[model samples]
Target: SMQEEDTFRELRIFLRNVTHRLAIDKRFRVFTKPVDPDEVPDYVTVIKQPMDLSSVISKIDLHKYLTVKDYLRDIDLICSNALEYNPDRDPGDRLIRHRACALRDTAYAIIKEELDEDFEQLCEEIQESR
Candidate 1:
């Protein structure tokens, strides 16, 4: 149960980062339209933009190749490593930080491929936006 909980927490964070990246880009109106007063926003508009696992699962039937548990487990490991190696840390942590940045890049690549959007550039734009 601890592992499951840990995995869930990590997946939540990982998904959050993926979603955060999505939101960060969406803020700039890359693939989607800019927010406007004429439109009615959804109840949970922020969370709605990022891919919903349940919807993705229902559409893709990913369970045939991997269980939701395994999917969450893999995502957990990825997020755990990403957090451990975040670039914001000190020199002693450089390797992991670099690795985390690489993984982040990989996430961007995959997302771009799936969404047919330029998240990699959007990532750069996000950095510049701040």
Candidate 2:
């Protein structure tokens, strides 16, 4: 568990850093805040559990995640929520969904590209130690 405890810090840092990566993007920047339910009452209808970039970092900084999968689920949610709400059938919706999908690929990449041996490495070590 100590090994994974180290992995937890590593996971937290990656979660923290990826938030920066998503926030700085000119296109991706739009997703940083919640879509005001007052402005679009329907957002909550389709998105039962809304997720956004700000919430992701909030959990990261607050230490809300018990494991990396929880972090990944949120990462997927931030984008999938957009894609699901804005179905490609709607021309207007498709544009941002495309960006959301693209961002998911980018976000997922950092987990392995920057993280393979460091973050998951600790997780793997923890498994081995057990």
Candidate 3:
């Protein structure tokens, strides 16, 4: 057995737990990025909300995000799926959304800074209902 794979898997699990915990926190905003723990004021109370599975996976838009709403929906779906699969725990939508936003924002921060001109136009072709 490869130790690297096991390490990667464990790291993934830790990330999952962290994300799930972040999602359950009620202070999290849907579109806004997650605050670094150190950045948060000590007086603020951190309340974790229950995660919702149904709403999370239901809103995913796979190909590309055309608008802020689409991005939000995709975040929900990914968070829900991640929580369901990674942790085997049921968390509510608010928490899921928070988790989703954090993940998405973190990714966006590092790699995909901007949408290509064609990406947006191509994204527009897809029907919202699907």
By lDDT, is 1 or 2 better?
2
Better of 1 and 2 by TM-score: 2
Q: Give per-residue lDDT, candidate 3, residue 68.
A: 35
**Which runs of model 3 end up more than 4 angstroms from their true locations?**
29-130
TM-score, structure 1 vs. true: 0.27
Deviation from native of the Cα of residue 117 in model 3, angstroms = 40
Candidate 2 regions with alpha-carbon error over 4 angstroms = 1-6, 124-130
Q: Rank the candidate models, highest lDDT first.
A: 2, 3, 1
Is 2 or 3 the stronger prediction by lDDT? 2
List model 2 lDDT by residue over 1-130, tens digit each: 5655766787788778887888888888768888898999988888988987888888888877655667778878878888778876877798788888877888888776776655564565554565
For candidate 1, which ten residues in a row score worst on lDDT? Answer: 26-35
Tell me, by lDDT, which candidate is best. Answer: 2
Write the residue-wise lDDT of candidate 1 on 6-125 in tens digits: 433444444445544533452212212222325525423533233222333332233221222333343334435445424465774565455444544555565455432343344334
